[PDB]
Point group: C2
Chain length 53, copies 2
């Protein structure tokens, strides 16, 4: 009852914390991959120009 | 307590779906970035030589 409610609340809080950590890590990885892809596109254009020259 | 547990389970399912979609997109982007990095390194080295 009350103790079960408190246990469920603690479990839900732990799950929310874990989900927030996972979402933050995923967003960070996505930002890093986006920056890497932008740098790769820039380097691809530069290498194309260099190969032409 | 039961209503809060059901709400918590629904929110956990939604967060798991969001995390799975984000992980799939991140894996796709990671494969693309690996391919792009390999191609860029190869082209740079060849043009340099």
């Amino acid at each position: 009852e009350e103790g079960k409610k408190k246990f469920q609340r603690e479990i839900e809080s732990l799950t929310q914390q874990f989900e927030e950590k996972a979402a933050s890590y995923d967003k960070l990885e996505k930002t890093k991959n986006r920056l890497q892809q932008e740098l790769d596109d820039l380097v691809v254009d530069l290498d194309n120009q260099r190969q032409l020259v």
